[model samples]
Target: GSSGSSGARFTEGLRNEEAMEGATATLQCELSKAAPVEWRKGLEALRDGDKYSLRQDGAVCELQIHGLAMADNGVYSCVCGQERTSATLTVRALPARFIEDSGPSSG
Candidate 1:
């Protein structure tokens, strides 16, 4: 029982991410020691879907979200053994710009 807890550690800490609506964002988590890990969004377990994907590469795990929306903004986390790391995601609406009209008579 004690042996399992000794090798559990987070190699990469969670980092906050920001993105615009309709964009894509990827979150990554890495462990120095291998263990069964799970990813979550807010209080819910995250699963792979048309808009979301989960992938594991060796000691690293990645979660990707496509077509980002306001609802996608929240806290995300990865849990392994008794260790947990989390980060916040913020989504913002696209910025607006004003276009000035020039004279049409110019050659």
Candidate 2:
């Protein structure tokens, strides 16, 4: 017997930038259609911990991180059960304060 097979579109290398100590940030995973999506932090097969909030509804995956900090800057990945499709999110946090010749400024 032969089983029907197909290929799924997988997203990757999605970049997301956020400022350190800034307001909350959301990383959106837009899919072509409705599908079961799972969110993970870095290479870990687990949730992103308290630093992140995941809103998964079908194909739409919204990942929110409150009170952006240095630790929040990293790679986040998402996978859909049906296609085994995956998406990568890169988070970057700017410095809270920078020093200049004149003086230092807080961001």
Candidate 3:
């Protein structure tokens, strides 16, 4: 995560036993609305990027991640305000092999 950013931190990772190839997972973040804010997927600086979506629910800032994939499994950060208040996020994608135990493998 970057410095001077808002309240951005890696919450946790989620793994689904029944994960499919076309399945989708979301990365949620509740930010402080007391000051100026913006949500981002990567380290880039952009308010309305294709990779991220910022939603404001009252005083809460929620960032949503859609269409999760293996490559999407990485560290994400959000920067807010001139001080660069940021947070870290870790997105994980479950493989098909892990969906079953002692079952037929994809390979």
Candidate 4:
């Protein structure tokens, strides 16, 4: 069972991902062979940067989105030729206090 074009597959696809407004989200996908893939958010294409980072190694492709926000809460797609995987990101509003919050006495 084979033709000619039979590549672009993720051994590990997107999973339940979530992040706050400040935290970063890292999406990962694995394949069998070494190939290049493209990433997209909703309908717009994504690029690599200090905030947006896309890296590929061997057969593994990973994406990192920094400084998450409520607007970032949407479907993320990973495209590879005719095949691609999509997943939703649960971006919630950041709560007060970066670390542990103690009891603040009300005057």
Clashes of each: 0, 0, 11, 0
TM accuracy, model 4: 0.78
Q: Write the per-residue lDDT of candidate 3 for residues 12-103, one digit (tens) a residue.
A: 22222223333543444433344446554455554545555566665455555555566655455545443333333344444454454575
Tens-digit lDDT track of model 2 for 1-107: 79955333445423554444555877666566655566666666655667667667765667776776566556666666444433333345554666757645775
Q: State every prediction's TM-score relative to the real structure.
A: 0.75, 0.52, 0.45, 0.78
lDDT of 1 by residue, 1-107 (tens): 46534456887877888778889988877888666687877788777888787778777877788888888888888887668998988898987878977778869
Candidate order by decreasing lDDT = 4, 1, 2, 3
Give per-residue CA lDDT, model 4, range 1-107, as digits (tens).
77766466676777778777778998878765777889999888888878898887877888899888888888998887657889888887866657776787885
Indicate which candidate wins on lDDT.
Answer: 4
User: Lowest summed lDDT over 10 consecutive residues: which window, candidate 1?
Assistant: 1-10
* Model 4 misplaced regions, further than 4 Å: 1-6, 97-107
1 or 2, which is superior by lDDT? 1
Clashing pairs in 2: none
The superposed Cα distance between candidate 3 and the true structure at residue 82, in angstroms, equals 4.9
In order, candidate lDDTs are 0.80, 0.58, 0.46, 0.81
